[PDB]
Amino acid sequence: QVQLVQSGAEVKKPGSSVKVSCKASGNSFSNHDVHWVRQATGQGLEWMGWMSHEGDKTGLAQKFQGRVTITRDSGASTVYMELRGLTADDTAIYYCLTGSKHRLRDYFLYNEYGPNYEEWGDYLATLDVWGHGTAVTVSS
Amino acid sequence: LGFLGAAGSTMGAASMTLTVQARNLLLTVWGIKQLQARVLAVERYLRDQQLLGIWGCSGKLICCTNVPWNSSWSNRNLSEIWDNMTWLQWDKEISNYTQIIYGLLEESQNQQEKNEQDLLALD
Amino acid sequence: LGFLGAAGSTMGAASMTLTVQARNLLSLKLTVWGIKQLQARVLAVERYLRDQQLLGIWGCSGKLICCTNVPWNSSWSNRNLSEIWDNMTWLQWDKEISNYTQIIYGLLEESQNQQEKNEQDLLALD
Amino acid sequence: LGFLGAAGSTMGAASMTLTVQARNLLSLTVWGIKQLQARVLAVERYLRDQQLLGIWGCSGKLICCTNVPWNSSWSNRNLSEIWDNMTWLQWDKEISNYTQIIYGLLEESQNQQEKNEQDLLALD
Amino acid sequence: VVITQSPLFLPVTPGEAASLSCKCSHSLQHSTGANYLAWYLQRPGQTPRLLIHLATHRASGVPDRFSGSGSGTDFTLKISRVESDDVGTYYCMQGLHSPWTFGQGTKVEIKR
Amino acid sequence: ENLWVTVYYGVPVWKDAETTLFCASDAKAYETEKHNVWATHACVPTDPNPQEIHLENVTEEFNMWKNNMVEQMHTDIISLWDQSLKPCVKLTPLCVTLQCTNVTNNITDDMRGELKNCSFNMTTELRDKKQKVYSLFYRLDVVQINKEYRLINCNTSAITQACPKVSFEPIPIHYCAPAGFAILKCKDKKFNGTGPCPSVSTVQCTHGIKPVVSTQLLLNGSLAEEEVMIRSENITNNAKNILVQFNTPVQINCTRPNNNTRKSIRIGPGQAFYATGDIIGDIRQAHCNVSKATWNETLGKVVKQLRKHFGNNTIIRFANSSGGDLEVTTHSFNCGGEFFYCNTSGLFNSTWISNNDSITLPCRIKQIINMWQRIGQAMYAPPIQGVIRCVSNITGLILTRDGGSTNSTTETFRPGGGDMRDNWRSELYKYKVVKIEPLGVAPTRCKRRVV
Amino acid sequence: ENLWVTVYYGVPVWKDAETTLFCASDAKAYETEKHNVWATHACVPTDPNPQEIHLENVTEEFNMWKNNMVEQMHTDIISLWDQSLKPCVKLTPLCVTLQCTNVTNNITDDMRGELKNCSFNMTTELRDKKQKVYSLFYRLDVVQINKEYRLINCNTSAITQACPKVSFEPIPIHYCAPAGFAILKCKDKKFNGTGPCPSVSTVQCTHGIKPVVSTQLLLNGSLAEEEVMIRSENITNNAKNILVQFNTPVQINCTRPNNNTRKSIRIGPGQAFYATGDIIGDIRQAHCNVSKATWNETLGKVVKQLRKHFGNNTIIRFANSSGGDLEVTTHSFNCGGEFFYCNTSGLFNSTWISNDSITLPCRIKQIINMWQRIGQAMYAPPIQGVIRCVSNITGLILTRDGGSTNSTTETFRPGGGDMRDNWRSELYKYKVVKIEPLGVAPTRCKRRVV
Amino acid sequence: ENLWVTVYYGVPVWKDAETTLFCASDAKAYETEKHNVWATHACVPTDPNPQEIHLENVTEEFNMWKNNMVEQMHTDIISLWDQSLKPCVKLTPLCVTLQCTNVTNNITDDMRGELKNCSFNMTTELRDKKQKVYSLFYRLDVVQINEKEYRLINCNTSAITQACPKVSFEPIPIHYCAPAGFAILKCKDKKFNGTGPCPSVSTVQCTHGIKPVVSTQLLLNGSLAEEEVMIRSENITNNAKNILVQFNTPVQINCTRPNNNTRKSIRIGPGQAFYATGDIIGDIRQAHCNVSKATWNETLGKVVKQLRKHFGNNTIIRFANSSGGDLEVTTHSFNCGGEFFYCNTSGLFNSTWISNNDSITLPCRIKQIINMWQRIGQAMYAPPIQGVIRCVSNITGLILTRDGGSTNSTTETFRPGGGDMRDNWRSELYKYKVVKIEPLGVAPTRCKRRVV
Ligand SMILES: *[C@@H]1O[C@H](CO)[C@@H](O[C@@H]2O[C@H](CO)[C@@H](O)[C@H](O)[C@H]2NC(C)=O)[C@H](O)[C@H]1NC(C)=O
Ligand SMILES: *[C@@H]1O[C@H](CO)[C@@H](O)[C@H](O)[C@H]1NC(C)=O
Ligand SMILES: *[C@@H]1O[C@H](CO)[C@@H](O)[C@H](O)[C@H]1NC(C)=O
Ligand SMILES: *[C@@H]1O[C@H](CO)[C@@H](O)[C@H](O)[C@H]1NC(C)=O
Numbered sequence A: 001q002v003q004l005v006q007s008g009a010e011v012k013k014p015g016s017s018v019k020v021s022c023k024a025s026g027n028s029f030s031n032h033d034v035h036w037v038r039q040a041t042g043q044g045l046e047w048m049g050w051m052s053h054e055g056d057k058t059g060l061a062q063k064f065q066g067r068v069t070i071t072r073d074s075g076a077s078t079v080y081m082e083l084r085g086l087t088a089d090d091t092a093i094y095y096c097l098t099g100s101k102h103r104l105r106d107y108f109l110y111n112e113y114g115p116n117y118e119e120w121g122d123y124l125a126t127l128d129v130w131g132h133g134t135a136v137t138v139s140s
Numbered sequence B: 001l002g003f004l005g006a007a008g009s010t011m012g013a014a015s016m017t018l019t020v021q022a023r024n025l026l027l028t029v030w031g032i033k034q035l036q037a038r039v040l041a042v043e044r045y046l047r048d049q050q051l052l053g054i055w056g057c058s059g060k061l062i063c064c065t066n067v068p069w070n071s072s073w074s075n076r077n078l079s080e081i082w083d084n085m086t087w088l089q090w091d092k093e094i095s096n097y098t099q100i101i102y103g104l105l106e107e108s109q110n111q112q113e114k115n116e117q118d119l120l121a122l123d
Numbered sequence C: 001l002g003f004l005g006a007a008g009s010t011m012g013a014a015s016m017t018l019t020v021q022a023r024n025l026l027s028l029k030l031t032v033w034g035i036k037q038l039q040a041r042v043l044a045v046e047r048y049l050r051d052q053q054l055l056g057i058w059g060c061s062g063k064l065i066c067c068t069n070v071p072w073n074s075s076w077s078n079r080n081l082s083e084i085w086d087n088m089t090w091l092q093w094d095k096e097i098s099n100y101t102q103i104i105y106g107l108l109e110e111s112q113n114q115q116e117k118n119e120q121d122l123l124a125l126d
Numbered sequence D: 001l002g003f004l005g006a007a008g009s010t011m012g013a014a015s016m017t018l019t020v021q022a023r024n025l026l027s028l029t030v031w032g033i034k035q036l037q038a039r040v041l042a043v044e045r046y047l048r049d050q051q052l053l054g055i056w057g058c059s060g061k062l063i064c065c066t067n068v069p070w071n072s073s074w075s076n077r078n079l080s081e082i083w084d085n086m087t088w089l090q091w092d093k094e095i096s097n098y099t100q101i102i103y104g105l106l107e108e109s110q111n112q113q114e115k116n117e118q119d120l121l122a123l124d
Numbered sequence E: 001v002v003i004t005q006s007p008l009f010l011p012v013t014p015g016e017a018a019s020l021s022c023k024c025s026h027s028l029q030h031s032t033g034a035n036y037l038a039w040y041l042q043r044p045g046q047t048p049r050l051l052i053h054l055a056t057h058r059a060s061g062v063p064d065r066f067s068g069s070g071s072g073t074d075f076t077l078k079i080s081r082v083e084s085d086d087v088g089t090y091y092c093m094q095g096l097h098s099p100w101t102f103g104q105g106t107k108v109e110i111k112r
Numbered sequence F: 001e002n003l004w005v006t007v008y009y010g011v012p013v014w015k016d017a018e019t020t021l022f023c024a025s026d027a028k029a030y031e032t033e034k035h036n037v038w039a040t041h042a043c044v045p046t047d048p049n050p051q052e053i054h055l056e057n058v059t060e061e062f063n064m065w066k067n068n069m070v071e072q073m074h075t076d077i078i079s080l081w082d083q084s085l086k087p088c089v090k091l092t093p094l095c096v097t098l099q100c101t102n103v104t105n106n107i108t109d110d111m112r113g114e115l116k117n118c119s120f121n122m123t124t125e126l127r128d129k130k131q132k133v134y135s136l137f138y139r140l141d142v143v144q145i146n147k148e149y150r151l152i153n154c155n156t157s158a159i160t161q162a163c164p165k166v167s168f169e170p171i172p173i174h175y176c177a178p179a180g181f182a183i184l185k186c187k188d189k190k191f192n193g194t195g196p197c198p199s200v201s202t203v204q205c206t207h208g209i210k211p212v213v214s215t216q217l218l219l220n221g222s223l224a225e226e227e228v229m230i231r232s233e234n235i236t237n238n239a240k241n242i243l244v245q246f247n248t249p250v251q252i253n254c255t256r257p258n259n260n261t262r263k264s265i266r267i268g269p270g271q272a273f274y275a276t277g278d279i280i281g282d283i284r285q286a287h288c289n290v291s292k293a294t295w296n297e298t299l300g301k302v303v304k305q306l307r308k309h310f311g312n313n314t315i316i317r318f319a320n321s322s323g324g325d326l327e328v329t330t331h332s333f334n335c336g337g338e339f340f341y342c343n344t345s346g347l348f349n350s351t352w353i354s355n356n357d358s359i360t361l362p363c364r365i366k367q368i369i370n371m372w373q374r375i376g377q378a379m380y381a382p383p384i385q386g387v388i389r390c391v392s393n394i395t396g397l398i399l400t401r402d403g404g405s406t407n408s409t410t411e412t413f414r415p416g417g418g419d420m421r422d423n424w425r426s427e428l429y430k431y432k433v434v435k436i437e438p439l440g441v442a443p444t445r446c447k448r449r450v451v
Numbered sequence G: 001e002n003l004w005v006t007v008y009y010g011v012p013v014w015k016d017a018e019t020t021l022f023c024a025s026d027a028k029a030y031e032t033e034k035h036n037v038w039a040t041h042a043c044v045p046t047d048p049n050p051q052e053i054h055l056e057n058v059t060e061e062f063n064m065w066k067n068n069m070v071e072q073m074h075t076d077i078i079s080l081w082d083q084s085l086k087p088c089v090k091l092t093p094l095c096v097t098l099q100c101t102n103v104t105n106n107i108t109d110d111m112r113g114e115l116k117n118c119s120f121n122m123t124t125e126l127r128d129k130k131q132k133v134y135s136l137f138y139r140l141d142v143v144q145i146n147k148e149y150r151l152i153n154c155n156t157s158a159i160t161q162a163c164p165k166v167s168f169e170p171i172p173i174h175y176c177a178p179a180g181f182a183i184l185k186c187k188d189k190k191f192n193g194t195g196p197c198p199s200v201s202t203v204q205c206t207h208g209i210k211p212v213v214s215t216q217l218l219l220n221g222s223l224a225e226e227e228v229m230i231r232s233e234n235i236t237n238n239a240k241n242i243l244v245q246f247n248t249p250v251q252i253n254c255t256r257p258n259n260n261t262r263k264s265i266r267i268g269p270g271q272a273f274y275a276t277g278d279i280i281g282d283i284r285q286a287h288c289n290v291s292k293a294t295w296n297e298t299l300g301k302v303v304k305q306l307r308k309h310f311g312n313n314t315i316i317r318f319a320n321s322s323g324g325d326l327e328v329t330t331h332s333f334n335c336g337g338e339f340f341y342c343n344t345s346g347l348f349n350s351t352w353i354s355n356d357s358i359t360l361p362c363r364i365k366q367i368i369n370m371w372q373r374i375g376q377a378m379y380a381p382p383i384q385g386v387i388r389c390v391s392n393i394t395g396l397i398l399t400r401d402g403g404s405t406n407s408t409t410e411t412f413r414p415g416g417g418d419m420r421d422n423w424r425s426e427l428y429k430y431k432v433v434k435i436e437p438l439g440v441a442p443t444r445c446k447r448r449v450v
Numbered sequence H: 001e002n003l004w005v006t007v008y009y010g011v012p013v014w015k016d017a018e019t020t021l022f023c024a025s026d027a028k029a030y031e032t033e034k035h036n037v038w039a040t041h042a043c044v045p046t047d048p049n050p051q052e053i054h055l056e057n058v059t060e061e062f063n064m065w066k067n068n069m070v071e072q073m074h075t076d077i078i079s080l081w082d083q084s085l086k087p088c089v090k091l092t093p094l095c096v097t098l099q100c101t102n103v104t105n106n107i108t109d110d111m112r113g114e115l116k117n118c119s120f121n122m123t124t125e126l127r128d129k130k131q132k133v134y135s136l137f138y139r140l141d142v143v144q145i146n147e148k149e150y151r152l153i154n155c156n157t158s159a160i161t162q163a164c165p166k167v168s169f170e171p172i173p174i175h176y177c178a179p180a181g182f183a184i185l186k187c188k189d190k191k192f193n194g195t196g197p198c199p200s201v202s203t204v205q206c207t208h209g210i211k212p213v214v215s216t217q218l219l220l221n222g223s224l225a226e227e228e229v230m231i232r233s234e235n236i237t238n239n240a241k242n243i244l245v246q247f248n249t250p251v252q253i254n255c256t257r258p259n260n261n262t263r264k265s266i267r268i269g270p271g272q273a274f275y276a277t278g279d280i281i282g283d284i285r286q287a288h289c290n291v292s293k294a295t296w297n298e299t300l301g302k303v304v305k306q307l308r309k310h311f312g313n314n315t316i317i318r319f320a321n322s323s324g325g326d327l328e329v330t331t332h333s334f335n336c337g338g339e340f341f342y343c344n345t346s347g348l349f350n351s352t353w354i355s356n357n358d359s360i361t362l363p364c365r366i367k368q369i370i371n372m373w374q375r376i377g378q379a380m381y382a383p384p385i386q387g388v389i390r391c392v393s394n395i396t397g398l399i400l401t402r403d404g405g406s407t408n409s410t411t412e413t414f415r416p417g418g419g420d421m422r423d424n425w426r427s428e429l430y431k432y433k434v435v436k437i438e439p440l441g442v443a444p445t446r447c448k449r450r451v452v
Helices: A025-030 B013-023 B029-054 B078-084 B087-093 B098-122 C013-023 C032-058 C081-086 C090-096 C101-124 D013-022 D030-056 D079-085 D088-095 D099-123 F069-085 F292-306 F420-428 G026-032 G069-085 G292-309 G344-348 G420-427 H069-085 H294-310 H345-349 H421-429
Strands: A004-006 A010-012 A016-024 A033-039 A046-051 A058-060 A068-072 A078-086 A092-109 A117-130 A134-138 B062-064 D063-065 E003-006 E009-012 E018-024 E037-042 E049-053 E066-071 E074-079 E088-094 E106-110 F004-009 F053-055 F060-063 F098-102 F115-119 F134-138 F142-144 F148-151 F181-186 F194-197 F200-203 F217-219 F229-231 F242-256 F262-268 F271-276 F287-291 F316-318 F331-333 F340-342 F350-352 F358-364 F378-380 F388-401 F411-415 F431-435 F439-444 G004-008 G052-055 G060-063 G098-101 G115-120 G133-138 G142-144 G148-151 G181-186 G194-197 G200-203 G217-219 G229-231 G242-256 G262-266 G272-276 G287-291 G316-318 G331-335 G338-342 G350-352 G357-364 G377-379 G387-400 G410-414 G430-434 G439-443 H004-008 H022-026 H053-055 H098-102 H115-120 H133-138 H142-144 H149-152 H160-162 H174-177 H182-187 H201-204 H206-210 H218-220 H230-232 H243-261 H263-269 H272-277 H288-292 H317-319 H332-334 H341-343 H351-353 H359-366 H379-381 H387-402 H412-416 H432-436 H441-445
Touching: A004 A092, A010 A016, A016 A025, A016 A092, A016 A134, A033 A068, A033 A117, A046 A068, A046 A078, A078 A134, B013 C101, B013 F004, B029 B098, B029 C032, B029 D030, B029 F069, B029 F439, B062 C101, B078 F439, B098 D013, B098 D063, C013 D030, C013 D099, C032 C101, C032 D030, C032 G069, C081 G439, D030 D099, D030 H022, D030 H069, D079 H441, D088 H441, D099 H004, E003 E088, E009 E018, E018 E088, E018 E106, E049 E066, E074 E088, F060 F181, F069 F420, F217 F242, F229 F292, F242 F292, F242 F420, F287 F292, F292 F316, F292 F350, F292 F358, F388 F420, G060 G181, G060 G430, G069 G420, G133 G272, G229 G292, G242 G292, G242 G338, G242 G420, G287 G292, G292 G316, G292 G350, G292 G357, G331 G387, G344 G357, G344 G410, G387 G420, H022 H206, H069 H421, H098 H149, H133 H272, H218 H243, H218 H332, H230 H294, H243 H294, H243 H341, H243 H421, H288 H294, H294 H317, H294 H351, H345 H359, H345 H412, H387 H421
Parallel strands: A010 A134, E009 E106, F134 F271, F316 F411, G316 G410, H160 H379, H317 H412
Antiparallel strands: A004 A016, A016 A078, A033 A046, A033 A092, A046 A058, A068 A078, A092 A117, A092 A134, B062 F004, D063 H004, E003 E018, E018 E074, E037 E049, E037 E088, E066 E074, E088 E106, F004 F439, F053 F200, F060 F194, F098 F115, F098 F148, F115 F134, F142 F148, F181 F200, F181 F431, F217 F388, F229 F242, F242 F287, F242 F388, F262 F271, F287 F358, F316 F350, F331 F340, F340 F358, F388 F411, G004 G439, G052 G200, G060 G194, G098 G115, G098 G148, G115 G133, G142 G148, G181 G200, G181 G430, G217 G387, G229 G242, G242 G287, G242 G387, G262 G272, G287 G357, G316 G350, G331 G338, G338 G357, G387 G410, H004 H441, H022 H174, H053 H201, H098 H115, H115 H133, H142 H149, H174 H206, H182 H201, H182 H432, H218 H387, H230 H243, H243 H288, H243 H387, H263 H272, H288 H359, H317 H351, H332 H341, H341 H359, H387 H412
């Protein structure tokens, strides 16, 4: 079981940004997909974003465009997430979890005298073991 | 006076148009074919002129040789040979004795008379 | 002497270099240089052969110098024969008679060689 | 009776097979291209020899008398010795080193002059 | 593509079987015939655990009292002989189309 | 006293022989503009004064289906066509899978299902970028993959096409005698394919012959001098094509009433490809007009000629085509730079017994072509913009005679014989290549003068 | 008594005609190395005695700009160039977009941005694998698609690059007329391009001419015998090119001061491609040097010869190029197997009235379009090390600005971007005519009656 | 005695010269069946009875290995191979990564690992579809991608194409014929040294047929030695020169590829048919060859007898297998039935010779991709051939090398080597020399020309 470390609970003022940190032992980010999920008490889970294990692709839920950026250290031993513009309704439990995906050619074209034109896509297989999570809340 | 007009006359009368007959003897697919055709024409003319030179009547449209031809090939009087048959059909008649005629006309007369012309020029 | 030595010599003086002029009348593989050289050899062969054919038809073959017996109507020239020999080059000669040439070819062929083979046939009749 | 048969005969006996030897002097695949090249080569050399024969005036002759003398510095054998006991082959080895001189002498000293003299004789 | 879950809550008598259902706007089968569905149960104060996956088999270590059914746009999760330790909130997972979302959820509690 | 032989040189010989025909063109009149496949932009020009020479008192033998200039020129044409196609760019990437739909609206009710609109996944000239392009396709050119469609020839040899500026219009050609060789022609107005000809003539160099390609009807052919000639290798044998040659022309009009446009497409770096853009105006089926009365009188003359080899009471029936490959089912021609396939069954639905003014035929367009009977090559017809219109002379027919016909009655015929060798025979039947052997021998009174 | 026409044979005859010229090279000296682009595998060796004889009493009509041997030259050289280009590798794979950077390595401040570090995900030997490879490129060979660069010549004919073993150094080529044809040359050192030549000679084969490729001034050419000469078939027509031929050479150096490093990568099986490797040391501009005082003294001599065709006291001025395609805009030439371009504007900044070295910056291009053709394109292989070039200037090609009034204040400009006039500069002395040994004349003989 | 020279033409002259050979075949006998590489589409037919002509009183020299027909004909076959392989398709797509398995079904235990069943991800003729395709391959033609993944052995070399299978590789006799104005000198001496004059000479217009046999250690289907087994080299003292040996009497060798191959057809693209070997029927057996033993002793003993003439004839003479290196010279190769074989002749050279049951079997290898000739700029894939291959051939000569460092004129040793095809072609063409006829000539005489 790869140990996962998350940032502690934090209270932040309305209309201001918040950042969290995340860790995994063994530098397993190179082999597992980085993921983020938010959930409030009594409400269903909400996907925030992902990095591929290669660190070559990033993505976000359409609700969080322009408010979330995802960074990692050299060697991808840790991953970081920054949130911007939190209000009182952004209070929830924020989670780390590794992931695994399927990489398949979505379209292709053989080339006799050149490289095969290829369109590749990532298809997440399942959500791996979750981290203990982080709690962030907004109050005056 | 047209080209190949003598075939319409007897073979005896055909000898008038000999000069007329001798006059016209001389990177795309068409270009390659043109090259091949020109080479073939040159080869054919030069092979014929090789015959003429070897037998010493070269440069002559008319030549009388010393070899006697041998009557079994065509037992006919010269006059009706000349005034009845065209050269086309008489050649058709004389068609398989051609190589024998070539060999005799080569060896029996030309090379020999040449040896005796050197012998005469010795004195 | 070298080639084309008689170019400025008079017509009579040009007759000394005829042999000199005649000495050079005839003198991947798919590369274009080789293609061109093959073409050139073929062309030279063809032209030399045509010249020899014409000479053989006129019956003075094997001769740099011959003399036919054919007459000509003198409107083609404007001067004395010794003048022709002396006071111009062949080049002015040719420019002067450049335009009766085909007539001359035809007359040299027919008016003499056909008739002469006729008399030699008459002779061979005996 | 065969081709080249004079190779073991003397210069004197060689003259019988001149005709036998002169019989065959003329007679997008790469093979076909080479065929074309060989045909052209044979044609041009045959015309080479005939041009030499014609410029010298033995046209239609394999053997032909001349008006050209020679310096004897070129050969030092009696005529019977060279003709009746020497192969034309070894003779060619012997005579190989003056051939250009004989060609020039033959081509100009006698032929051009004799053509001019034929003209002079014709004039009258 | 959307996901809904029913019932919102299900009181259960102990020892009696119960079922939960979730439906989606598009069929969950794949052109290869594969189905990408996973049901999860979270105990309050604990993270969710996989119960069934791909709508065909139970996850390893899941009690055999669990079962599933459904195809196309309709799927169900049925549990036999309900015992008190299954109380929590349940969710079914959709894995065919990006973005992948959870259903609104159903909660099972002991009737009282 | 006894005669001796003498050497005669230059005497005219006729020897049956074959050599390669020398290309020729009419003074290179086309050389002012580019470009022509059948002219290669140039051949050796010829003088306008070749002089046919009559051969009085001369007869000579001809043998059609045995003369060889025909197949010589056949391989000449195959070589020239391949040479013209070679510099052009291949169209191999085109048969990536196509999503297609039927053309709708602004259509003639008789067009339904003829044209299809398809799109591509096909890439850009940059190997790392893709694009979506579309073009209008005929139904006959494409086939379903199992709606989705694929180009029909990507389970045979590949398809290549470029060089659209090069014209396919035919040019007069002279197959002009090599030196030492001659061309002779029969002067008889009516002459069998074989046998001696009572009056013959020779030319130094041939007449203008067109390289046109036609399947069921002879086009731009020379007129028969007096009457509609019927020729074949053997009339009794049904495996031999029956040649029909008109002595009077029969005009035929054809057109593509559709106003067409073209879209240039870049597939690779510097390789332009052309596709058929959306047609302007209503769609109308291509069709051909011929005159009704002229066709009837011409076929009456044809059946009168047919009666010569048969019993005079035999019923002459003409029939709908036999089927098979489309190139022998329908009449085909290329005029205007584009290929056609027309229903000639209407022209041959009639019978003949002893003792308004025009006709129109539905016709077909195919832009994917397998020329001759080759399998290893294929090409694409470039779109041509606007309405094309061609007028041409129908000058002959290529027919086959059905088997059976027991008890010598009710003879029937159907079009066939898709071999263009027969067309080129139909034009070249006048000529034969012969060999001149100038040397010869003969007896005489000459005995050689001593010394 | 009356005269009769005789027939002669062997009489020397000349007809203004054209045939394909022989190939001839000096003793096949190129055969020792494999091989020159023009000399190739084989050509006919030269005669050891290329004998020529002055023709007594002959003046001959010569016509520069009308001889067709120069067109044969143009066609044959294009044919040879494509012949050498043909058995080489296409580089259609290179059209893939390249991620590029503005790299410097102790660069001089006047080249910042002239070189780009471009990488692309490329091709492997195996179809199913890809790899990332970088190489250094000149900015003028690439273009922004809308940084990412694409090489400039992908929206035109395809690009091919291979076969570095062939040599681009000119070799003198001699030409011999076909047998039955002859070569005529003018012995007048002051001869015009056209008109009668008072003193003439004929030769079996022409002298050697190197297939020099230049666009603004002549190189490696023959020197004028006595004085600088200016030629143009019609000086009044300003759209026509003006020939300038020096009688004294003008030495010119050109170099690329840095070493070059090379790397090679495989497009696929048998697909060797050479790429410019990373370049070490201070990075400096290719440039050419010419002496100042000589550049006057030759230009002043040119002006003195120039005044012959115009009225006295006419003002003469030179200026920098009016623009256009870069080939005519800047002077281009190949040395060390590599193509160059230089801003020759500095050496025309002068004026002329009645009565120690110059340094020129230069530019490098690798994707090159031969002559004016657009249907072919190639990549120049990198040349290792510092290229050093010593060369002679033997002439210039000029154009005359039109207009003006009162026949004064003439201004000239480089031009004539056709190399046709480059080979004309050497070929102008020569013509080939047709010899028909046959002749006729009257005489006093009659053929003997037999 | 004031003699004058006189012109003779047609006189017999030889001049050492080289020109292009003239292709020839007896009446184009290859036309009976299509299609053959070495006979090509067409060649000039020749008379079945060339007129050989004995030159009596004649001696002349044949400097062997100086003759240029060999190099000219070497270039000819290189060109012919290239032109036969130009039209047919390329095979760059094959060496995508291969998933291979470990053939153990119906296999003889002496051969485990010779054949691999590999699968890969090449596409169809459709530009946007792929297909899973499998085929068996000999281990000699493949390598592991890493230290398993497999790749074709020659992709990091030059390009690879398929020999399109319609045209056979069988040799046909090729006749070399003199251009006009040439003749082909031929020796008659029955023991004629590779260099030096030949006591009796004959010439022909046109030569007999020679099979373009491709072999590496043994001379095959060659002309037999006329009287005795005989040995030639440029200089026997220089061991860098190959040692040519010609057998007096032939030794028959049987070779078969004993297994049923099956073949399958795969579409690569439009108009691109590909062939690969399907599953083999029956137990798999190594291909091999058969040769007699006492006859092998007999030929080798005769070789020793003739070798003793160039040495002190009490010396020890020993053979051993090749010193190694590239298999093209380490192993013997032949192409019978249109397929490539490499056979371990090491057993043929396990013997010693001193002063004063009936058969031998040899294992053979199989490869499909070939680096033909000594070129490295091309690689070609031979078709799989269905059924059991069978060849019967004549062994007519040897090519050997002699080890250096020998001292005191004892213990002379030899190994097979010199695999350059030029040596076989010398061994076949050693009887001929192209020569020039110069018919013109001059000579003195008593003739003086007539006065003009
Ligand atoms: C488009 O036109 C084609 C024919 O041009 C129609 O093809 C029909 O397809 C159905 C279903 O596969 C078949 O049952 C018919 O037999 C086909 N018709 C013919 C003539 O073959 C197709 O239905 C048309 N599509 C639309 C949307 O109109
Ligand atoms: C030719 O005749 C004219 C007129 O009689 C004469 O004046 C002239 O001198 C002659 N020509 C020569 C060269 O003597
Ligand atoms: C295949 O067989 C060879 C020996 O025949 C052996 O070295 C190799 O390990 C085998 N591979 C497998 C996967 O068993
Ligand atoms: C090999 O050769 C000799 C004679 O050639 C023979 O006697 C000897 O026994 C042979 N060796 C074997 C193993 O038979």
